Design a binder for this molecule. Structure first.
Ligand SMILES: Cc1cc2nc3c(=O)[nH]c(=O)nc-3n(C[C@H](O)[C@H](O)[C@H](O)COP(=O)(O)OP(=O)(O)OC[C@H]3O[C@@H](n4cnc5c(N)ncnc54)[C@H](O)[C@@H]3O)c2cc1C
Ligand SMILES: Cc1cc2nc3c(=O)[nH]c(=O)nc-3n(C[C@H](O)[C@H](O)[C@H](O)COP(=O)(O)OP(=O)(O)OC[C@H]3O[C@@H](n4cnc5c(N)ncnc54)[C@H](O)[C@@H]3O)c2cc1C
Ligand SMILES: COCCNC1CCN(C(C)=O)CC1
Ligand SMILES: COCCNC1CCN(C(C)=O)CC1
Ligand SMILES: COCCNC1CCN(C(C)=O)CC1
Ligand SMILES: COCCNC1CCN(C(C)=O)CC1
Lengths: 587, 587
C-alpha cells in the first residue's frame, strides 16, 4: 500500500528529496541544491499521517531510516554527509544529470494540454522537451505556438463574439441617453483581425518565453513515436533525427474534417482559416450544426454579414434539445438563415483576389432529405462538420498503443496507454470532454504524479460548458432527455422560468427569450442532475454553480441560498414552477 | 412535538384542509371549495412521515380521526358530509368569512418585504391588507408603490450604472473594428431619467395589478399600530380611521439621514431625489463613503460629470478593506476626486431654476482631521451618510414592541417581536443584512409559517453582496481581517490572483487591476470562509459560489471543479499563490 506508492514514486521521480520541515540537516541539503540550481521535488514526511511508515520503507532502497534521503532517477544518492561530499568534490552536477535517456519527458504536441504538462514537470527537475508543429491548411494557413484554442479556437472565437456583442451595446446606448446614431456606423473586418492577431502574437511569444524560463527545450518539429522510448523528429528543413525519453505524453489534438464531395477542399475553408482571413467573407454559407458552426455564423451576422447555416438533422447534437432550439430560434429572429434537413453535394465561379482583398464566388448544390434540390451562390463556404485526430502521423502502430474505433487513445483513469511509459491527454484521450481546461488539468495533474509522487486524479464528470452564440447557453450536468432516459419520467422534476435582464428593459429588448431550468431527481432528495441557462454572460453565471453540483447540490440548497439583486443569476435561487404542473414559465 | 406544531397550525391558519392525495372524499371537498372560489391551505397527510401521528392529534380538536377535516380560524368546521351540507344550504360563504377581526393579516409598508409577505399569505386564504405611503423628501419628491429598491434604490441605481458602463463599450468598439468616434458623443441626462422612470412606472402599476389579482386590499395610507390588533390609518385627505387584524407584519423600511449642520436640509439632496432629478446635477459633491455614495459618484463620473467624494475616515466600512481600497483606487484613476479625512461644517449662492432646468450653486465649508480648512463651490451636494428607521411614526410605545439602541425591532429567529401576534421583516429587523432578497425571503417564508403550517426559517448567514461601482466588487462570507480576528493569523490561508478579462485585451485596458481571493481556515480542511472578486459582472460571478459556500465548500472543492473557458470566473478554479508565500499575484 504505502510500500507500493513509495516504489512508484522513487522509480519515476527525476530528482527527489525526502525531508522533514524541522530538520537542519534537511535544510542544509536544500540550500546546497538551491545554490547549485538543481531543481527537485520534496516530500515532507512530517506533514503526512503516513510519514513514519514511509520512513521505514525508505530503508528498502537505501538501508537507512533517517532524513534527508536524496534519489536521482531511481537511485539512492546519499544522506547529508554524502551529498555535501559530492558537492565539495564537484561530482554533484554529473550525478544528477546522469540518465539512460536524453529526456525525462518528451511531450508531443505544444497546445493546451502539452504546454501545461511540460511546464509543471520541469518544476520538479524533470529534463523536458516539448515538440510542436502546425500542418498547414489546404490553402496554406499556419500559426505559432500554443495549440488550437490560442490560435484558431476559444481565444479568437470569443474576441470576435465580443465584437458582435458590441453591435447591440451601440444600439442600446441611445436608449440610455447617449447621442450616437447606430444606423450610421459600420464594421471593418480587417481592423478587427489585426487586433485579434496581435493578441494571439503576444500569446505565441509568451509561451516561448515561459518555456525558456522553465529550462524546457522547445523543438519546432514534427514528432513520431517509433518505439516506446524513441521519438523521430523532422524539422523545418526536413532534417530527421531521433531523441529518447523516459516518459512520453501524447498531446497532439485534432483538426477539422471535410466532407467527401467535389470542390470542398479546393474552394471551401474551415475555422482554421477564418480567424486570420485577410478579407471579410461576404455572403457566407456555414455547413454544419455543432457549436463551432453556430458560434461562427452568429458573430458573422452581428458584424453585418449575410449568413446561411445548412443543417443535416439537428442543432447541437449531444446538448439538451429544448435549449438547442431556443438558441437557434434566437439566431433566426436576429438575421441568421437556416437550410434545415439539407446536405451539400458539390461546390467555382470566381477566384479569390488576394491583391485587392476580395473573396471569390461559389455555386453550392445540395438536396433536402425529401429529395428536393438546393442551389445557391455564395462568396465563402465554411465547413464545420467535426474534428478528428490523425494519429497515424504521430504513432507507429508497432509501438503497441491501442486506439478505439474513432482513432482516439484508450487510456486508464490515470491517462496511461497500453504501453507502460506512454500517456495521452486532451482531445485524443478517448471518451473525455474535449475542452481546454480539461486538457490543462489532466496535464498538470499527470506531471505531478510522475515526478512529484502525487496521487490526485483528474475528475472528468459534470464538467460545465458554455456555447457563445449571440445569446449564450451555459450548462452543467445532464440534459433533461438524458436524465429521463436514465431514471424514468416519474422520477424527474424540472423547475424552470423565463427572465429578462434589467439591462434589457430601458433598451426595449425581448421579454420572454431568456430561460433557465434545473433538472432534479425526486427519489434522491431532489438532487440537481443538470443546470441550464440561456442569457447574457451565461459562462460567468454557470461557473460557480459547477462547484455546488460537484458537491451534490439539491433543490433545497438552491432555495436556502439568498440571491444577489439585481442579477440574472439570482433567478436560480427562487425557482418554483415545475413542468409537471403545466403552469406557464413567462415573467 | 407533533402535537405542539398541530396546535400552532390550527390556531393561526385562516382556512385549512387536512387531506390525503388518495381520498375521493378529500377531492370532492377540494372541488366544492375550488368552485366556490374559497382559497385555503392544504396539508396532505400521506406525504409526511409524521402523518399517522398527526391524524390522531386532529381528534383533540374535532373528536374524529379521518380525512378530510376542514378548519376556519381555529374552529373545526366539519367532515365531508358536513361541509357539503353547508354548501347545499348556502351557509358556507358566511362560515369561512366569520372573523373576530377585519383582516387575518395587516402589512404596514408596501416595499420589498411587505409586498412579498402579503401576496404569499393571500395564496392560502388569509384576508389581507397592505398599507403603503411615501413621506415626501424635504424638496417634495415622492413616488409610487413598491418600496425603496424599486423606486429610489437597486433598480434605478443599476440602470444608471448600465448607462455609465456603456461609455466604456463605446470606447472599446473602435478597437474591435466599429467606425464610431467616441470623442464626438455626449450624454443627455433627462433622456436617461425619462427611460428609467418609465420602467419604474411599469413596476408601480404591476404591483397594483398583482395585489388586485390576489384579492389583497391595498390602502394608500399611513399606518400606526396603537394596540396589538388595532392599526390607525390616515389617508391622502387626512381622514382617520381604525382597522383590526389578527397577525401584524411591520415592514416600513428606512430613509436617508442628514448631518446636523446649517444648510444641509435646505440646499442638499439625497439618493431619494437623485433618481428622478429633472436636470443633470453638474459639478457634484458626494458626502459619505458607503456603497450608495460610491455607486452614485461612480456613474455620475462615467456620464461626464465633475465629481468629488468627501470621506470622513474609510471607504466601505464593514467590507474587506483591501478590496475597498482597490475599488476606490480604480475610481480615482478614472476621474473621481476624493477629499480624504474630511467632514462638512455648513452649506446658498444661486437658487435652483426649475423652469429652465438648471441647478443652483452652493458653497461648502469643512475641515480635515488635522484642522486644515476645506472650501469649494458645487452645483449639487448629495448626502449619503446612512439610513435609519422612524418607528416612532409607526408604533405607539405602549403596544410593547421592544426596540434596540438604534431604533430597530428586536426579533426572535422566526421574526416575532415581544408582542406575540406582531412580526417584523426587512431593514427594520435588528441585526439582519439590509438587502432586498433577504426581505423577500423573510416575508414569503413567514407567511407560509403563519397560514400554511410551514416550519422553514430564513437563513441569514453568509448572504452574498455586490457593490456596483464602475469596477464591480462581489463578496460572500468573511472579510480577511474578520477571519484573522476570529481564528488567528496562523490558522488563515489566503489564495489570490490578478486577472485580465479577455474582452480587455483588444481594447487595451489595464493588466493588473482585476483581483480575486479565497480566505480559508487551515484547521478545518481549508474551508472557504470568504470569497472576494473585483471585476466586470461581479454579481453574476459571485452568485453561484454562494450555494457552494452555503454547503461548506473547501479549497479542494474549488480545485477539483473544472473551469469554463474563456471566462473571468474560471480563475477561482485554479488558484495557487498564497499570501504567506510572498509570491507576486500579477498575471
Ligand atoms: C473553433 C473552436 C473553438 C473552441 N472554443 C472552445 C471554448 O470556447 N472553450 C473550450 O474549453 N474549448 C474550446 N475549443 C476546444 C479546445 O480548442 C480544445 O479542447 C483544446 O485546444 C485541446 O487541447 P489539446 O492539448 O488536446 O490539443 P491542441 O490545443 O489542438 O494542441 C495540439 C498541438 O499539437 C500539434 N501537433 C499535432 N501533431 C503533431 C506532431 N506529430 N508533432 C508535433 N506537434 C504536433 C498541433 O499542431 C497543435 O499545435 C474550441 C475548439 C475549436 C476548434
Ligand atoms: C440607493 C440604494 C441602493 C440600493 N441597492 C441595493 C441593491 O443593489 N441590492 C439590494 O439587495 N439592496 C439594495 N438596497 C437596499 C434595499 O433597497 C432595501 O434593503 C429594501 O428596499 C428593504 O425593503 P423593506 O421591505 O425592508 O423596506 P422598503 O423597501 O424601504 O419599503 C418600506 C415601505 O413602507 C413605507 N412606509 C413607511 N412608513 C410607513 C407607514 N407608517 N405606513 C405605511 N407605509 C409606510 C415606505 O414609504 C416604503 O414604501 C439599496 C438601497 C438604497 C437606498
Ligand atoms: C516527412 O516529414 C515531413 C515533415 N513536415 C513538417 C514540415 C516543416 N515543419 C515545421 C517545423 O514547420 C516540420 C516538418
Ligand atoms: C478604384 O479601384 C477600385 C478597386 N477595384 C477592385 C478590383 C478587384 N475586384 C474584384 C476582385 O472583384 C473589385 C474591384
Ligand atoms: C397626521 O397624519 C398625517 C398623515 N400624512 C400622510 C399624507 C398623505 N398620505 C398619502 C396617502 O399620501 C397619507 C397621510
Ligand atoms: C436662449 O435661451 C437660453 C436659455 N437661458 C438660460 C436661463 C437660465 N440660466 C440659469 C438658471 O443660470 C441659464 C441661461
Amino acid at each position: 500500500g504505502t510500500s507500493q506508492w513509495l516504489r512508484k514514486t522513487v522509480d519515476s521521480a527525476a530528482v527527489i528529496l525526502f525531508s522533514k520541515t524541522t530538520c537542519p540537516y534537511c535544510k542544509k541539503v536544500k540550500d546546497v541544491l538551491a545554490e547549485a540550481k538543481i531543481k527537485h521535488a520534496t516530500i515532507e514526511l512530517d506533514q503526512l499521517s503516513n510519514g513514519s511508515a514511509i520512513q521505514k520503507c525508505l530503508a528498502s532502497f537505501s538501508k537507512i531510516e533517517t532524513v534527508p534521503q536524496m534519489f536521482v532517477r531511481g537511485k539512492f544518492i546519499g544522506d547529508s554527509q554524502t551529498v555535501l561530499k559530492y558537492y565539495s568534490n564537484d561530482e554533484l552536477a554529473g550525478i544528477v544529470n546522469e540518465s539512460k535517456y536524453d529526456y525525462d519527458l518528451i511531450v508531443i504536441g505544444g497546445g493546451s494540454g502539452g504546454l501545461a504538462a511540460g511546464k509543471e514537470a520541469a518544476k520538479y527537475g524533470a529534463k523536458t522537451a516539448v515538440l510542436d508543429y502546425v500542418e498547414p491548411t489546404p490553402i496554406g494557413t499556419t500559426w505559432g505556438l500554443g495549440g488550437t484554442c490560442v490560435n484558431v479556437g476559444c481565444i479568437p472565437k470569443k474576441l470576435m463574439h465580443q465584437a458582435g456583442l458590441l453591435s447591440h451595446a451601440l444600439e442600446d446606448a441611445e436608449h440610455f441617453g447617449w447621442s450616437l446614431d447606430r444606423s450610421k456606423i459600420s464594421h471593418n473586418w480587417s481592423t478587427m483581425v489585426e487586433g485579434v492577431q496581435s493578441h494571439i502574437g503576444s500569446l505565441n511569444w509568451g509561451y516561448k518565453v515561459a518555456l525558456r524560463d522553465n529550462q524546457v527545450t522547445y523543438l519546432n518539429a514534427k514528432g513520431r513515436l517509433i518505439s516506446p522510448h524513441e521519438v523521430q523528429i523532422t524539422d523545418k528543413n526536413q532534417k530527421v533525427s531521433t531523441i529518447t525519453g523516459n516518459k512520453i505524453i501524447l498531446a497532439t489534438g485534432e483538426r477539422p474534417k471535410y466532407p467527401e464531395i467535389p470542390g470542398a477542399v479546393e474552394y471551401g475553408i474551415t475555422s482554421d482559416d477564418l480567424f486570420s482571413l485577410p478579407y471579410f467573407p461576404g455572403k457566407t454559407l456555414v455547413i454544419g450544426a455543432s457549436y463551432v458552426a453556430l458560434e461562427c455564423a452568429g458573430f458573422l451576422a452581428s458584424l453585418g454579414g449575410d449568413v446561411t447555416v445548412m443543417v443535416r438533422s439537428i442543432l447541437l447534437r449531444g446538448f439538451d434539445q429544448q435549449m438547442a432550439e431556443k438558441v437557434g430560434d434566437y439566431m433566426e429572429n436576429h438575421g441568421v438563415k437556416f437550410a434545415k434537413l439539407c446536405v451539400p453535394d458539390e461546390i467555382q465561379l470566381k477566384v479569390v483576389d488576394t491583391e485587392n482583398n476580395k473573396p471569390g464566388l461559389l455555386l453550392v448544390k445540395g438536396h433536402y432529405t425529401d429529395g428536393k434540390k438546393f442551389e445557391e451562390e455564395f462568396e465563402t463556404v465554411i465547413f464545420a462538420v467535426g474534428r478528428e485526430p490523425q494519429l497515424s502521423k504521430v504513432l507507429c502502430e508497432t509501438v503497441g498503443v491501442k486506439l478505439d474505433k474513432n482513432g482516439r487513445v484508450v487510456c486508464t483513469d490515470d491517462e496511461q496507454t497500453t504501453v507502460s511509459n506512454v500517456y495521452a491527454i486532451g482531445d485524443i484521450n478517448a471518451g473525455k470532454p474535449q475542452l481546454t481546461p480539461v486538457a490543462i488539468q489532466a496535464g498538470r495533474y499527470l506531471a505531478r504524479r510522475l515526478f512529484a509522487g502525487a496521487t490526485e486524479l483528474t475528475d472528468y464528470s459534470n464538467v460545465a460548458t458554455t456555447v457563445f452564440t449571440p445569446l449564450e447557453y451555459g450548462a452543467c450536468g445532464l440534459s433533461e432527455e438524458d436524465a429521463i432516459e436514465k431514471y424514468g419520467d416519474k422520477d424527474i422534476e424540472v423547475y424552470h422560468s423565463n427572465f429578462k435582464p434589467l439591462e434589457w428593459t430601458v433598451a426595449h429588448r425581448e421579454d420572454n427569450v431568456c430561460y433557465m431550468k434545473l433538472v432534479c431527481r425526486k427519489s434522491d432528495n431532489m438532487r440537481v442532475l443538470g443546470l441550464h441557462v440561456l442569457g447574457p454572460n451565461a459562462g460567468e453565471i454557470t461557473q460557480g454553480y459547477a462547484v455546488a453540483i460537484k458537491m451534490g447540490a439539491t433543490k433545497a440548497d438552491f432555495d436556502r441560498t439568498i440571491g444577489i439583486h439585481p442579477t440574472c443569476s439570482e433567478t436560480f435561487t427562487t425557482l418554483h414552477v415545475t413542468k409537471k404542473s403545466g403552469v406557464s414559465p413567462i415573467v
